[PDB]
Write an enzyme that holds these catalytic residues in place. Sequence first.
Site, mmCIF file in Angstrom:
data_model
loop_
_atom_site.group_PDB
_atom_site.id
_atom_site.type_symbol
_atom_site.label_atom_id
_atom_site.label_comp_id
_atom_site.label_asym_id
_atom_site.label_seq_id
_atom_site.Cartn_x
_atom_site.Cartn_y
_atom_site.Cartn_z
ATOM 1 N N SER A 47 0.784 -0.914 0.249
ATOM 2 C CA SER A 47 -0.061 -0.412 0.168
ATOM 3 C C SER A 47 0.943 0.928 -0.033
ATOM 4 C CB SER A 47 -1.450 0.495 1.291
ATOM 5 O OG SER A 47 -2.047 -0.997 1.130
ATOM 6 N N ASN A 109 -8.514 0.680 -0.662
ATOM 7 C CA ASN A 109 -7.872 0.348 -2.473
ATOM 8 C C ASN A 109 -9.263 0.696 -3.151
ATOM 9 O OD1 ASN A 109 -5.905 -1.666 -1.389
ATOM 10 N ND2 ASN A 109 -7.158 -2.919 -0.724
ATOM 11 N N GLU A 145 -3.498 -6.996 -6.954
ATOM 12 C CA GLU A 145 -2.843 -7.913 -7.948
ATOM 13 C C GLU A 145 -1.635 -7.590 -7.524
ATOM 14 O OE1 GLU A 145 -5.383 -6.839 -9.846
ATOM 15 O OE2 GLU A 145 -6.798 -8.418 -10.424
#
Length: 269
Positions: A47, A109, A145
Amino acid sequence: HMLTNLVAEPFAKLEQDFGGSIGVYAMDTGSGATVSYRAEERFPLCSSFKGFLAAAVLARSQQQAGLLDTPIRYGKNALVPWSPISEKYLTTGMTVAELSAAAVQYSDNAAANLLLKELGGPAGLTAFMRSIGDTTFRLDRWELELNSAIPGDARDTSSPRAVTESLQKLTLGSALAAPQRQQFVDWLKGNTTGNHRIRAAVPADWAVGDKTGTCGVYGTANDYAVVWPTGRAPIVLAVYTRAPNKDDKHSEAVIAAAARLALEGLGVN
Ligand SMILES: Cn1c(=O)cc(CP(=O)(O)O)c2cc(F)c(C3CC3)cc21
Protein backbone atom coordinates in the site's frame (compact mmCIF):
# COMPACT_ATOMS: atom_id res chain seq x y z
CA HIS A 1 27.62 10.14 6.54
CA MET A 2 28.32 6.54 7.73
CA LEU A 3 26.56 6.54 11.18
CA THR A 4 25.34 3.08 9.88
CA ASN A 5 28.22 1.30 11.77
CA LEU A 6 26.84 2.66 15.09
CA VAL A 7 23.90 0.21 14.25
CA ALA A 8 24.95 -2.34 11.39
CA GLU A 9 25.27 -5.22 14.00
CA PRO A 10 21.94 -4.39 15.82
CA PHE A 11 20.12 -4.42 12.39
CA ALA A 12 21.59 -7.84 11.44
CA LYS A 13 20.46 -9.22 14.85
CA LEU A 14 16.97 -7.73 14.42
CA GLU A 15 16.49 -9.26 10.98
CA GLN A 16 17.91 -12.65 12.18
CA ASP A 17 15.22 -12.65 14.99
CA PHE A 18 12.51 -11.60 12.45
CA GLY A 19 13.53 -14.41 10.00
CA GLY A 20 13.62 -12.27 6.86
CA SER A 21 15.13 -9.12 5.34
CA ILE A 22 14.85 -5.58 6.69
CA GLY A 23 15.68 -2.55 4.52
CA VAL A 24 16.19 0.88 6.08
CA TYR A 25 17.21 4.33 4.83
CA ALA A 26 17.10 7.37 7.12
CA MET A 27 18.26 10.94 6.30
CA ASP A 28 18.93 13.80 8.74
CA THR A 29 17.87 16.74 6.50
CA GLY A 30 19.97 19.11 8.67
CA SER A 31 23.47 17.56 8.29
CA GLY A 32 22.74 15.15 5.40
CA ALA A 33 23.87 12.28 7.74
CA THR A 34 22.34 8.90 6.65
CA VAL A 35 21.76 5.40 8.06
CA SER A 36 21.56 2.54 5.44
CA TYR A 37 20.80 -1.16 5.85
CA ARG A 38 19.89 -3.11 2.63
CA ALA A 39 18.95 0.42 1.38
CA GLU A 40 19.51 -0.46 -2.33
CA GLU A 41 17.54 -3.72 -2.36
CA ARG A 42 14.05 -3.90 -3.89
CA PHE A 43 11.11 -4.54 -1.56
CA PRO A 44 7.41 -4.71 -2.53
CA LEU A 45 5.65 -1.34 -2.09
CA CYS A 46 2.32 -2.92 -1.01
CA SER A 47 0.00 0.00 0.00
CA SER A 48 2.95 2.44 0.42
CA PHE A 49 2.59 3.56 -3.24
CA LYS A 50 -0.72 5.26 -2.18
CA GLY A 51 1.20 8.17 -0.60
CA PHE A 52 3.15 8.79 -3.84
CA LEU A 53 -0.23 8.39 -5.70
CA ALA A 54 -1.75 11.25 -3.60
CA ALA A 55 1.38 13.36 -4.28
CA ALA A 56 0.99 12.75 -8.07
CA VAL A 57 -2.72 13.86 -7.86
CA LEU A 58 -1.58 17.02 -5.99
CA ALA A 59 1.09 17.64 -8.69
CA ARG A 60 -1.63 17.27 -11.40
CA SER A 61 -3.82 19.73 -9.37
CA GLN A 62 -1.14 22.45 -9.96
CA GLN A 63 -2.01 22.19 -13.76
CA GLN A 64 -5.81 21.41 -13.42
CA ALA A 65 -7.50 23.95 -11.04
CA GLY A 66 -10.77 21.96 -10.70
CA LEU A 67 -9.20 18.55 -10.15
CA LEU A 68 -9.37 18.11 -6.35
CA ASP A 69 -13.08 19.14 -6.20
CA THR A 70 -14.18 16.83 -9.02
CA PRO A 71 -16.88 14.33 -7.86
CA ILE A 72 -16.16 10.72 -8.78
CA ARG A 73 -18.97 8.17 -8.90
CA TYR A 74 -18.22 4.46 -8.79
CA GLY A 75 -20.03 1.13 -8.81
CA LYS A 76 -20.11 -1.72 -6.32
CA ASN A 77 -17.60 -3.64 -8.53
CA ALA A 78 -14.97 -0.92 -7.70
CA LEU A 79 -15.11 -1.93 -3.92
CA VAL A 80 -12.29 -4.40 -3.55
CA PRO A 81 -11.26 -5.56 -0.06
CA TRP A 82 -9.89 -2.88 2.39
CA SER A 83 -12.02 0.04 1.07
CA PRO A 84 -13.26 1.31 4.46
CA ILE A 85 -14.06 4.91 3.39
CA SER A 86 -15.23 4.40 -0.26
CA GLU A 87 -17.72 1.68 0.88
CA LYS A 88 -19.52 4.42 2.98
CA TYR A 89 -19.89 6.74 -0.09
CA LEU A 90 -20.84 4.15 -2.77
CA THR A 91 -24.31 5.67 -3.12
CA THR A 92 -23.03 9.32 -3.21
CA GLY A 93 -19.51 9.40 -4.74
CA MET A 94 -16.51 11.24 -3.29
CA THR A 95 -14.25 14.03 -4.54
CA VAL A 96 -10.73 13.45 -5.91
CA ALA A 97 -9.37 15.16 -2.73
CA GLU A 98 -11.50 12.86 -0.53
CA LEU A 99 -10.32 9.75 -2.45
CA SER A 100 -6.68 10.97 -2.04
CA ALA A 101 -7.18 11.46 1.74
CA ALA A 102 -8.81 7.96 1.97
CA ALA A 103 -5.95 6.33 0.03
CA VAL A 104 -3.34 7.98 2.32
CA GLN A 105 -5.04 7.85 5.72
CA TYR A 106 -7.07 4.59 5.50
CA SER A 107 -5.06 2.81 2.75
CA ASP A 108 -8.43 2.63 0.86
CA ASN A 109 -8.03 0.26 -2.14
CA ALA A 110 -11.04 1.35 -4.22
CA ALA A 111 -9.87 4.98 -3.77
CA ALA A 112 -6.33 3.97 -4.85
CA ASN A 113 -7.60 2.24 -8.05
CA LEU A 114 -9.89 5.17 -8.91
CA LEU A 115 -6.98 7.64 -8.59
CA LEU A 116 -4.65 5.32 -10.58
CA LYS A 117 -7.30 5.43 -13.35
CA GLU A 118 -7.19 9.29 -13.21
CA LEU A 119 -3.36 9.25 -13.76
CA GLY A 120 -3.36 6.67 -16.61
CA GLY A 121 -2.67 3.62 -14.48
CA PRO A 122 0.50 2.26 -12.84
CA ALA A 123 2.62 3.62 -15.72
CA GLY A 124 1.21 7.11 -14.99
CA LEU A 125 2.29 6.98 -11.38
CA THR A 126 5.72 5.58 -12.46
CA ALA A 127 5.97 8.53 -14.92
CA PHE A 128 5.32 11.02 -12.06
CA MET A 129 8.11 9.36 -9.96
CA ARG A 130 10.51 9.60 -12.96
CA SER A 131 9.59 13.31 -13.25
CA ILE A 132 10.97 14.00 -9.70
CA GLY A 133 14.20 12.01 -10.48
CA ASP A 134 13.26 8.62 -8.97
CA THR A 135 14.67 5.98 -11.40
CA THR A 136 14.04 3.01 -9.05
CA PHE A 137 10.28 3.15 -8.32
CA ARG A 138 8.05 0.97 -10.45
CA LEU A 139 4.32 0.33 -10.19
CA ASP A 140 3.13 -2.38 -12.57
CA ARG A 141 -0.30 -3.57 -11.35
CA TRP A 142 -3.48 -2.42 -9.60
CA GLU A 143 -5.04 -3.34 -6.25
CA LEU A 144 -5.13 -6.17 -5.19
CA GLU A 145 -2.73 -7.96 -7.64
CA LEU A 146 0.20 -5.61 -6.80
CA ASN A 147 0.42 -7.30 -3.31
CA SER A 148 1.76 -10.71 -4.57
CA ALA A 149 5.26 -9.91 -3.13
CA ILE A 150 6.80 -12.84 -5.06
CA PRO A 151 10.48 -13.36 -4.13
CA GLY A 152 12.75 -11.83 -6.78
CA ASP A 153 9.86 -10.17 -8.66
CA ALA A 154 10.74 -6.50 -9.34
CA ARG A 155 7.12 -5.57 -10.23
CA ASP A 156 5.54 -3.10 -7.77
CA THR A 157 8.82 -2.45 -5.84
CA SER A 158 11.23 0.28 -4.91
CA SER A 159 14.28 0.57 -2.58
CA PRO A 160 14.26 2.13 0.90
CA ARG A 161 16.78 4.76 -0.32
CA ALA A 162 14.64 5.72 -3.40
CA VAL A 163 11.49 5.91 -1.22
CA THR A 164 13.23 8.21 1.32
CA GLU A 165 14.78 10.38 -1.44
CA SER A 166 11.37 10.81 -3.16
CA LEU A 167 9.53 11.44 0.13
CA GLN A 168 12.07 14.17 1.02
CA LYS A 169 11.60 15.87 -2.38
CA LEU A 170 7.78 15.83 -2.03
CA THR A 171 7.38 16.83 1.67
CA LEU A 172 10.41 19.11 2.26
CA GLY A 173 11.93 19.86 -1.17
CA SER A 174 10.55 21.60 -4.24
CA ALA A 175 8.84 18.75 -6.17
CA LEU A 176 5.39 20.20 -5.18
CA ALA A 177 4.20 23.84 -5.00
CA ALA A 178 4.07 25.05 -1.32
CA PRO A 179 0.26 24.65 -0.82
CA GLN A 180 0.33 21.14 -2.39
CA ARG A 181 3.42 20.23 -0.31
CA GLN A 182 1.60 21.24 2.92
CA GLN A 183 -1.53 19.26 1.84
CA PHE A 184 0.64 16.14 1.29
CA VAL A 185 2.25 16.61 4.74
CA ASP A 186 -1.17 17.10 6.37
CA TRP A 187 -2.54 13.87 4.75
CA LEU A 188 0.52 11.88 5.99
CA LYS A 189 0.20 13.45 9.51
CA GLY A 190 -3.45 12.30 9.57
CA ASN A 191 -2.67 8.67 8.70
CA THR A 192 -4.61 6.20 10.93
CA THR A 193 -2.87 2.89 9.98
CA GLY A 194 0.68 3.48 11.25
CA ASN A 195 0.38 3.71 15.05
CA HIS A 196 2.40 0.46 15.58
CA ARG A 197 5.20 1.19 13.10
CA ILE A 198 7.55 4.21 12.78
CA ARG A 199 5.13 6.25 15.05
CA ALA A 200 5.76 3.68 17.86
CA ALA A 201 9.45 4.80 17.86
CA VAL A 202 8.67 8.61 17.88
CA PRO A 203 8.15 10.70 21.08
CA ALA A 204 4.63 12.25 21.52
CA ASP A 205 6.02 15.80 21.31
CA TRP A 206 7.43 15.22 17.76
CA ALA A 207 5.28 15.67 14.63
CA VAL A 208 5.17 12.67 12.25
CA GLY A 209 3.50 11.86 8.92
CA ASP A 210 3.67 8.30 7.58
CA LYS A 211 2.30 5.86 4.99
CA THR A 212 2.09 2.09 5.67
CA GLY A 213 2.07 -0.95 3.39
CA THR A 214 1.08 -4.53 4.16
CA CYS A 215 1.00 -7.16 1.39
CA GLY A 216 -0.34 -9.96 3.63
CA VAL A 217 2.17 -12.60 2.36
CA TYR A 218 5.94 -13.27 2.41
CA GLY A 219 6.46 -11.40 5.73
CA THR A 220 6.11 -8.23 3.61
CA ALA A 221 5.17 -4.85 5.18
CA ASN A 222 6.63 -1.39 5.43
CA ASP A 223 6.27 2.21 6.53
CA TYR A 224 7.84 5.52 5.53
CA ALA A 225 7.69 8.78 7.44
CA VAL A 226 8.83 12.34 7.84
CA VAL A 227 9.54 13.11 11.52
CA TRP A 228 9.94 16.65 12.95
CA PRO A 229 11.95 16.39 16.19
CA THR A 230 11.84 19.55 18.30
CA GLY A 231 14.86 21.83 17.98
CA ARG A 232 16.47 20.10 14.93
CA ALA A 233 15.82 19.56 11.21
CA PRO A 234 13.36 16.91 10.09
CA ILE A 235 14.29 13.23 9.54
CA VAL A 236 13.00 11.24 6.55
CA LEU A 237 13.04 7.42 6.76
CA ALA A 238 11.78 4.23 5.11
CA VAL A 239 11.53 0.77 6.70
CA TYR A 240 10.65 -2.22 4.45
CA THR A 241 10.51 -5.95 5.24
CA ARG A 242 10.11 -9.21 3.36
CA ALA A 243 10.71 -12.89 4.16
CA PRO A 244 11.35 -16.06 2.14
CA ASN A 245 8.15 -18.11 2.66
CA LYS A 246 4.62 -17.22 1.49
CA ASP A 247 3.05 -17.88 4.95
CA ASP A 248 5.77 -15.90 6.83
CA LYS A 249 4.01 -13.20 8.83
CA HIS A 250 5.00 -9.55 8.89
CA SER A 251 5.87 -7.87 12.21
CA GLU A 252 4.84 -4.32 13.10
CA ALA A 253 7.15 -4.59 16.16
CA VAL A 254 10.17 -5.32 13.87
CA ILE A 255 9.30 -2.19 11.79
CA ALA A 256 9.11 -0.03 15.00
CA ALA A 257 12.41 -1.58 16.28
CA ALA A 258 14.14 -0.87 12.92
CA ALA A 259 12.84 2.73 13.06
CA ARG A 260 14.22 3.08 16.65
CA LEU A 261 17.67 1.78 15.50
CA ALA A 262 17.69 4.23 12.53
CA LEU A 263 16.91 7.20 14.80
CA GLU A 264 19.56 5.99 17.33
CA GLY A 265 22.12 5.82 14.45
CA LEU A 266 21.33 9.44 13.49
CA GLY A 267 21.87 10.42 17.18
CA VAL A 268 18.25 11.51 17.46
CA ASN A 269 16.77 11.89 21.00
C1 LIG B 1 -3.53 -7.31 5.65
N1 LIG B 1 -3.53 -5.79 5.57
C2 LIG B 1 -3.25 -5.04 6.77
O1 LIG B 1 -3.04 -5.59 7.79
C3 LIG B 1 -3.17 -3.55 6.81
C4 LIG B 1 -3.47 -2.96 5.56
C5 LIG B 1 -3.35 -1.43 5.48
P1 LIG B 1 -1.63 -1.03 4.87
O2 LIG B 1 -0.68 -1.36 6.02
O3 LIG B 1 -1.36 -1.78 3.59
O4 LIG B 1 -1.59 0.45 4.58
C6 LIG B 1 -3.76 -3.74 4.28
C7 LIG B 1 -3.98 -3.12 3.01
C8 LIG B 1 -4.23 -3.93 1.85
F1 LIG B 1 -4.41 -3.37 0.60
C9 LIG B 1 -4.24 -5.33 1.90
C10 LIG B 1 -4.48 -6.27 0.70
C11 LIG B 1 -3.51 -7.43 0.43
C12 LIG B 1 -4.99 -7.70 0.78
C13 LIG B 1 -3.99 -5.91 3.13
C14 LIG B 1 -3.77 -5.14 4.28
